[PDB]
C-alpha cells in the first residue's frame, strides 16, 4: 500500500490552496500508479460512490482519454470537484457544457465550434495578438511593480478569447470576474458568491450578445454559433449558454494560470530564463504547458467493466485522470523535473490525454504563451518575485490568484 496518510484524498482542494501533492503523485506511481482513493459520506466533492481511481501514468490516461466508447464525459462530467452539498441536478446542467457531452451529440457539436480554431485562423491571429502582448508588458513594466497575475498574465488569454467570441473589449473584465467566481468557488476570495447566479449572468450576457449579432452578424462565435445547423435545428438556448460558459471558462483559467507559472518556473531558473530572453524557443509553451499542468485533473466514468493495467474498472465508476501527475511520469520524460525549454519530443497530456476531446484552444494556448514570453522579456528581462504566489483553492483546477513582483528587480 502506498506511504499516504489515512484519509488522503487527491481532489481535496485544501491541498491545492497551499501545494500541488508533487510526492504524493509520485509515491502512488512508484508503489500504486493506479489507487483507490476512497471517499467518507458526504466528502466526495458532489459524488456519492464512496470515490474514485487516481490514475497517474500517462500511458494510462491516454488509454482512457482515447477511448471514450468505455469512459464516458457525460455521465458523470468531467470536473472531479465541487462543493460537498452541490445538488445532483446541478452537476447535471453541466452536461450542456460541449465538454461533458459523448458522441455523437459531441462529435457534432465539436465540428462546429472547431470551425474558428483552424490552424490558419489562429495564425490570422498573430499580429492582433502580438501587438497586444506587448502594450501589456508595456504597460506592466510602467507600473514598476504589482500583481503579475493581474497586470500580467490575464491580459492576453481574455482579450484573445473576448475578442474570438465577440465581446467588445470594454466588457471583457466581465467574462473575467464572472468566470473566476464559477471556478473560485471554493476559495475564500470568492466567498459569498453563488456560482450557479455568476453561470446565470454570464448566459443573460451570451443571449445579450446573440441578439447584437442577430441584427449584426460577424466573423466571431457568437455569429457562428446562433447561425449554427444541426440536421435543420439551430442550438438550443441551453446548449447556445453554456457554449459561452465553456468558451469563457477555457479562455480565462487555463492559459494565464500557464503563463504565472512559467514566470515562475523561470523566477526558479535564471538558466533557463537568460536561455529563453536569448533564443525564444517554440519549445517553449509546451514545456511551460507541463511544467504549469494549469488543469490538475480530470474524470470519466466507466460504462462497462474494463481491465486498465492489470486493475479490473466497473462499471459506473469514475476514473481521475491526474494530468499533474502524468506530466511528471519518470518512464515517460528524460528528468522530469528539470525544467527544460528546449525538451522535444515533449509528449506531455497537458491539453488531455488527446481522442476525441482534444483542446481545440492549444495552438491558440500555445501562441498566446510564446507572445506574451516574448513582450516580457523585452519589457522586463530582469523581473524578480516579491512575496509568494498566492494559490487557488480548488480541487481540480491549478491556479494561482496573486504573485507579487518588482519588474525592475
Ligand atoms: C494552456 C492552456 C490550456 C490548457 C492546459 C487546456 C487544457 C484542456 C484539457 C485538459 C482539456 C480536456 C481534453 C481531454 O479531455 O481530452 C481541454 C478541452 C478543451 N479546451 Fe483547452 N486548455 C487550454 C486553453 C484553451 C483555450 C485558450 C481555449 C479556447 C479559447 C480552449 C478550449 C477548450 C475546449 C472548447 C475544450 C473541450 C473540447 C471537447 O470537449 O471536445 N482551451 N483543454
Ligand atoms: C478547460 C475548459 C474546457 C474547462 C471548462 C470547465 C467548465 C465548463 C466548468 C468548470 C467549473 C464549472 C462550474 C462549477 C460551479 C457550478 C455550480 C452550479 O451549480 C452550476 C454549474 C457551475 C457554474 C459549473 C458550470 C461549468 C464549469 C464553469
Redesign the pocket.
Known amino acids: 500500500s502506498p506511504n499516504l496518510p489515512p484519509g488522503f484524498d487527491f481532489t481535496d482542494p485544501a491541498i491545492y490552496a497551499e501545494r500541488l501533492p508533487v510526492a504524493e503523485f509520485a509515491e502512488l506511481r512508484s508503489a500504486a500508479p493506479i489507487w483507490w482513493n476512497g471517499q467518507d459520506p458526504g466528502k466526495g466533492g458532489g459524488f456519492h460512490d464512496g470515490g474514485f481511481w487516481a490514475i497517474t501514468k500517462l500511458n494510462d490516461v491516454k488509454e482512457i482519454?482515447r477511448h471514450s466508447d468505455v469512459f464516458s464525459s457525460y455521465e458523470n462530467g468531467?470536473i472531479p470537484r465541487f462543493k460537498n452539498d452541490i445538488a445532483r441536478e446541478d452537476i447535471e446542467v453541466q452536461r450542456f457544457v460541449?465538454?461533458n457531452m459523448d458522441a455523437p451529440h459531441?462529435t457534432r457539436l465539436?465540428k462546429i465550434?472547431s470551425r474558428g480554431f483552424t490552424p490558419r485562423a489562429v495564425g490570422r491571429l498573430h499580429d492582433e495578438l502580438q501587438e497586444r502582448a506587448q502594450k501589456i508588458a508595456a504597460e506592466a513594466a510602467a507600473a514598476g511593480s504589482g500583481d503579475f497575475v493581474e497586470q500580467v498574465s490575464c491580459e492576453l488569454?481574455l482579450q484573445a478569447?473576448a475578442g474570438?467570441l465577440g465581446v467588445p473589449q470594454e466588457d471583457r473584465g466581465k467574462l473575467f470576474h464572472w468566470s473566476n467566481e464559477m471556478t473560485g468557488n471554493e476559495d475564500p476570495e470568492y466567498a459569498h458568491i453563488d456560482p450557479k447566479a455568476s453561470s446565470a449572468e454570464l448566459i443573460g450576457y451570451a443571449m445579450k450578445m446573440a441578439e447584437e449579432k442577430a441584427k449584426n452578424p460577424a466573423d466571431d462565435i457568437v455569429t457562428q454559433l446562433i447561425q449554427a445547423d444541426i440536421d435543420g435545428e439551430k442550438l438550443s438556448d441551453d446548449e447556445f449558454g453554456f457554449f459561452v460558459v465553456?468558451?469563457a471558462v477555457?479562455?480565462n483559467e487555463?492559459?494565464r494560470n500557464?503563463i504565472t507559472q512559467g514566470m515562475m518556473a523561470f523566477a526558479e531558473h535564471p538558466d533557463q530564463w537568460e536561455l529563453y530572453k536569448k533564443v525564444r524557443p517554440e519549445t517553449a509553451a509546451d514545456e511551460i504547458?507541463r511544467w504549469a499542468t494549469?488543469?490538475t485533473a480530470?474524470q470519466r466514468t466507466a460504462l462497462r467493466d474494463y481491465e486498465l493495467s492489470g486493475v479490473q474498472i466497473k462499471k459506473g465508476q469514475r476514473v481521475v485522470m491526474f494530468?499533474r501527475s502524468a506530466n511528471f511520469d519518470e518512464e515517460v520524460f528524460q528528468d522530469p523535473f528539470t525544467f527544460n525549454i528546449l525538451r522535444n519530443p515533449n509528449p506531455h497530456v497537458?491539453?488531455?490525454?488527446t481522442?476525441?476531446?482534444?483542446?481545440?484552444?492549444?495552438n491558440?494556448?500555445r501562441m498566446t504563451i510564446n507572445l506574451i514570453f516574448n513582450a516580457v522579456a523585452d519589457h522586463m528581462p530582469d523581473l524578480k518575485p516579491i512575496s509568494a504566489p498566492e494559490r487557488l483553492r480548488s480541487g481540480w483546477l491549478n491556479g494561482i490568484k496573486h504573485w507579487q513582483v518588482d519588474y525592475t528587480g
Not at 497537458?350 to 490525454?353: A, H, K, P, W
Open positions: 482519454s468531467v460541449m465538454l459531441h465539436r465550434i488569454p478569447i474570438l465553456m468558451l477555457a479562455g487555463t492559459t500557464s504547458v494549469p488543469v480530470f494530468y497537458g491539453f488531455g490525454g481522442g476525441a476531446h482534444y483542446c481545440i484552444g492549444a491558440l494556448a
